[PDB]
Amino acid sequence: YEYGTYCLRRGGAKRGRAEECFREALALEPAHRGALLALLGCSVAAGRNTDPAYLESAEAAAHRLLDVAGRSSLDAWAALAVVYRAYGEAKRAELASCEQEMARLEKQQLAAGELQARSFISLANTLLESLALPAEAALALELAAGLRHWPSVGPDTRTLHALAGALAEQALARAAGGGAASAAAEAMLTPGSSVLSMMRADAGEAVSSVAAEAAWRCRLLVAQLHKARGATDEAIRFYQEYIEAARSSGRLAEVPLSAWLELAEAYAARGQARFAADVFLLGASARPGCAVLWRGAGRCFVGAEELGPADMALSEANVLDPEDPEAWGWLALVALREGRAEDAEKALAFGLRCGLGDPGLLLDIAAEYRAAGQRRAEQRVLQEVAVKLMPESCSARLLLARCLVAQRCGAEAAEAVAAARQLAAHEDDEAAVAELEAELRG
Amino acid sequence: LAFGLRCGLGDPGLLLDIAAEYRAAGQRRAEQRVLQEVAVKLMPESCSARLLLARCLVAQRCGAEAAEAVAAARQLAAHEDDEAAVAELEAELRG
Amino acid sequence: RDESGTGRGALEEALAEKEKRAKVAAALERVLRDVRMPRRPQPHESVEELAAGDAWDRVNGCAAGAVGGPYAWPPLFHSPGVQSELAEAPAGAGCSLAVLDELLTELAAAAPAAAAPLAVRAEEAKARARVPPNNRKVLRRA
Amino acid sequence: RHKVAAGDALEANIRSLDSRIEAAQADAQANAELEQLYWERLCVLRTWTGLGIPTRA
Amino acid sequence: KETFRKYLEQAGAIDVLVKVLVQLYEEPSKPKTALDYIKQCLGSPTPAEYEAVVAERDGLQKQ
Amino acid sequence: SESQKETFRKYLEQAGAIDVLVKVLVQLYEEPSKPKTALDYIKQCLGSPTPAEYEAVVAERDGLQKQ
């Protein structure tokens, strides 16, 4: 299920792989979360006509699995109702009697129908966040709207419905990735918006017990919408206000790691690189378990050219041993900038033995080696980065050719002659090729 | 294997077979502790085993083990196809 | 050093095989669901061909005296292959439905063994004649 | 009334071929003609579609 | 997956396959080698060498 | 009709089988170089449209002319 969620994070690339993982989990064992994930993944199917094709007709097995998970389950009946309403002509009529079964059942528990709308919202929260299916979130919102008791529902549940709808809209914009994602952000920033109403309800302390938990995420999404709109300074101010509220209630209790990364990126976009490094270090100190944030904190602190705090953070980044292919390389770059030539060479070798080398970090390390020039180190770094990390980029190939020419005269011009035919669509590469030909002739 | 290494006589063919068995389900530490000792102590004059260990070390750690490839370039097992294989391995290490 | 040389490649190969199987099943499902039998025009019958049907409908389905009256059941339609099978008189409609049955009654005494195999083909011809050739022909019969 | 009688002969023909088909399925289990029968079964089925005969579930 | 299906729909191979299957189902006398009937419905597969040889023979006859 | 559709599916499964088209689909998916027209891919799949003995008649005639 974790692998399927990771695959569904990149939904448009490995959807077949995610479907295969869900099928493998379902064949291995009956899991409610796995069945829900498989149903939410098959629910779109490009309008139920893609490779899944009649997955709408095949979801009778999913409905049977839902009935096996719960004999009288509001969430299961709501999932079946959502599937019928999104994929049928009259099957929602049987879903209305299914919803009427729970409506009579919910009254006995009290002996309103607030749980009737709450059943769809829980499926909406699972689809939008855990399953990352904006289409399934929209279908669950449609089912919640199609619940029979529209007028008498709870305003806090209606506030939860509005928060789910805003999350679904943001997820739809992010999954589309085209047109104008800021147009939805402009609508959310326009006067009288639902996100503004959620912020006003957060400001109001009368009903803060059950509304502020969703209002915090609403404010974070509003800050992200402002950042996507472009007002990075005002978005950073709103995000800092949200972080202050998080410090008031519980700092790592929400653990907004992606939001902290976005805030660090927004602060680093402006000139406050040292302030961005301080904020990243504050988040890392608040959450000592998430050692992956320490790598980004050290990368941000390296920009202020203060190698002491950079190495101090890089030690905690390297505490997480194996998955530090970029952190070990950054530590090697820091050591090569300050002194430890042999240790930097060993750490660069360890980073190369690790999975992936970062292109920009490799270019910076190659520039540092060129400054503290060594022919063998330049050949080990720049040529490897050009061959593997940046095969398409001809500027790195030209730099490696110049380094090899300076290292071993005109006799090492084999790579220069090989890569000199196609070089970066001219501009300055014509002058670079002219200099390379002059060096080869010399 | 540690007990046998502490023991005096390591058999060359048996060590080569054990190294091939480890390479079938490769472990880098086992390969470095087996094939290097076999090519150094059991058969230093040999070239084919040294070339195989050089190929394993190159596939393990890229340019850090190019010294073994250079040593394979010194003696390439009476040339023939072994010299061409060593040249291909050297080109791969350069790439 | 993570031992990702083996195992990870096998998992990637298994994922690729599962994806290929899913894509093949999807293509097969699309091709199977695309199946449809197109509508076609009703094939016309010649007036000479229609001449044999109506006379047979008079002889087999409208003659007063046959087994079933003028509304004998099940209905039958005249086809050249079935009619030639029955053929294989002075009124010109010999070896018809009414003519052969009395002949099969007549030829049973002389040659029951010959009548046994011929009636097997005749009954199959009688069974096939129940199937109408054309859509409007059943409407014409009705 | 004419539509039911035409489909009655085809359904009996469909029953007769399926009896040959199911036996050929048993024959294949003990061991092509089934593939030969299906097109003839499709020939009978399309005639019901062509004439517009009512289908039986 | 979905991109491959979209590319196949743009190519139109599903339409040709459906037409071939419709022709095969409509033809009563089903051949034993249905792939031969499918190839006959499709057209001329791997005939390029024979076409070149026939063109060479026609040029020899003309000259 | 449902019976007509079931008979068509059974006939397609029996005669020719889905594996013949599945092999072509699997080859097209495995090959990353896919053309704009799938007719070229079908022709590359081939399947001897003319028979080997049928195509050999012109070759035998040419050989007899050369003899």
Q: Can you tell me the distance from the alpha carbon of C96 to that of C57, in angstroms, rounded to the nearest whole number?
A: 11
Is the preceding peptide bond at C74 cis, omega within 30 degrees of 0? yes
A427: left (phi > 0), else alpha (psi -120 to 50), else beta? Answer: left
Closest CA to A162 of A205, A204, A189, A199: A199
Q: Which residue has the tokens 């792939």?
A: E35
Q: Give the pair of three-digit tokens for residue E24.
A: 């095969």
Using the Cβ of F27 and the Cβ atoms of chain D, whether some distance falls under 8 Å is answered with no
CA nearest to C37 within chain D: D46
Q: Can you tell me the distance from the alpha carbon of B41 to that of B44, in angstroms, rounded to the nearest whole number?
A: 6
Q: Can you tell me the distance from the alpha carbon of F23 to that of F41, in angstroms, rounded to the nearest whole number?
A: 12
* Phi, psi (degrees; rounded to nearest 5) at C137: -65, -40
Q: Can you tell me the distance from the alpha carbon of D25 to that of D18, in angstroms, rounded to the nearest whole number?
A: 10
3-state secondary structure of F60: helix
DSSP notation for F21-40: HHHHHHHHHH-S---S-HHH
SS (H, E, C) A403-433: HHHHHHHHHHCHHHHHHCCCCCCCCCHHHHH
Query: Judging by beta carbons within 10 Å of its beta carbon (0-12, 13-18, 19+), is residue A279 exposed, middle or buried?
Result: buried
Q: Can you tell me the distance from the alpha carbon of E63 to that of E52, in angstroms, rounded to the nearest whole number?
A: 16
CA nearest to B56 within chain C: C5
Closest CA to A310 of A319, A318, A301: A301
Which chains pack against D, by 3+ Cβ pairs within 8 A?
C, E, F
Q: Can you tell me the distance from the alpha carbon of A161 to that of A141, in angstroms, rounded to the nearest whole number?
A: 7
Q: Can you tell me the distance from the alpha carbon of A9 to that of A258, in angstroms, rounded to the nearest whole number?
A: 13
How far does the CA of residue B67 sit from the closest CA of chain A (Å)? 13
CA nearest to E25 within chain D: D39
Task: List the resolution, Å.
Answer: 3.7
SS (H, E, C) A82-128: HHHHHHCCCHHHHHHHHHHHHHHHHHHHHCCCHHHHHHHHHHHHHHH
Q: Identify whether the C-beta of residue B70 lies closer than 8 Å to the C-beta of residue B81.
A: no
Using the Cβ of E35 and the Cβ atoms of chain D, whether some distance falls under 8 Å is answered with no
Q: Can you tell me the distance from the alpha carbon of F33 to that of A248, in angstroms, rounded to the nearest whole number?
A: 58
**Measured on CA atoms in the order D5, D9, D12, D18, is the torsion positive or negative?**
negative
DSSP notation for D1-57: -HHHHHHHHHHHHHHHHHHHHHHHHHHHHH--HHHHHHHHHHHHHHHHHHHTPPP--
DSSP notation for B56-79: HHHHHHGGGGHHHHHHHHH--SSS
Q: Identify whether the C-beta of residue C95 lies closer than 8 Å to the C-beta of residue C103.
A: yes
Q: Can you tell me the distance from the alpha carbon of C20 to that of C11, in angstroms, rounded to the nearest whole number?
A: 14
Q: Can you tell me the distance from the alpha carbon of C1 to that of B30, in angstroms, rounded to the nearest whole number?
A: 12
Q: At what angle do helices A429-441 and A394-408 cross, to 10 degrees?
A: 20
Q: Give the pair of three-digit tokens for residue C91.
A: 């009124």
Q: Give the pair of three-digit tokens for residue A39.
A: 């149903």
Looking at the partner chain, which of F8, F12, F26 has a beta carbon nearest the beta carbon of C20? F26
3-state secondary structure of A291: coil
Q: Can you tell me the distance from the alpha carbon of B30 to that of B18, in angstroms, rounded to the nearest whole number?
A: 10
Which chains pack against F, by 3+ Cβ pairs within 8 A?
C, D, E
Closest CA to A139 of A178, A217, A85: A85
Q: Can you tell me the distance from the alpha carbon of A311 to that of A330, in angstroms, rounded to the nearest whole number?
A: 10
SS3 helix, strand, coil % of chain A, rounded to 5? 75, 0, 25
Q: In angstroms, what CA-CA distances link A210 with A163, A241, A243, A389, F18?
A: 13, 20, 19, 50, 57
Which chains pack against B, by 3+ Cβ pairs within 8 A?
A, C
- DSSP structural state of residue C95: T
* Phi, psi (degrees; rounded to nearest 5) at C134: -125, 155
Q: How many CB atoms lie within 10 A of CB F63?
A: 10
3-state secondary structure of A191: coil
The experimental method, as deposited, was cryo-EM
Q: In angstroms, what CA-CA distances link A95 with A90, A105, F29?
A: 9, 15, 40
**Residues of C whose CB is below 8 A from E5:** 26-27, 30
Q: How many CB atoms lie within 10 A of CB A51?
A: 22
Helix (H) or strand (E) holding A210, with range, is helix A208-229
Type of residue numbered A144: A
**Residues of F whose CB is below 8 A from E12:** 38
Q: Can you tell me the distance from the alpha carbon of D33 to that of D20, in angstroms, rounded to the nearest whole number?
A: 9
Q: Identify whether the C-beta of residue A271 lies closer than 8 Å to the C-beta of residue A232.
A: no
Residues 6-25 of E with CB under 8 A from D: 25
Q: Identify whether the C-beta of residue A51 lies closer than 8 Å to the C-beta of residue E5.
A: yes
Q: In angstroms, what CA-CA distances link C141 with A98, B47, C72?
A: 52, 97, 12
- DSSP structural state of residue A297: H
Q: Do chains F and B touch (3 or more CB pairs under 8 A)?
A: no
Closest CA to A342 of A322, A319, A372: A372
| Contact check, Cβ <8 Å, C33/A53 | yes
List of long-range contacts for C28-31, beta carbons under 8 Å, 24+ apart: C28/F18, C28/F21, C28/F22, C28/F25, C29/A53, C29/A54, C30/A53, C30/E5, C30/E14, C31/E14, C31/E17, C31/E18, C31/E21, C31/F21
- DSSP structural state of residue C42: P
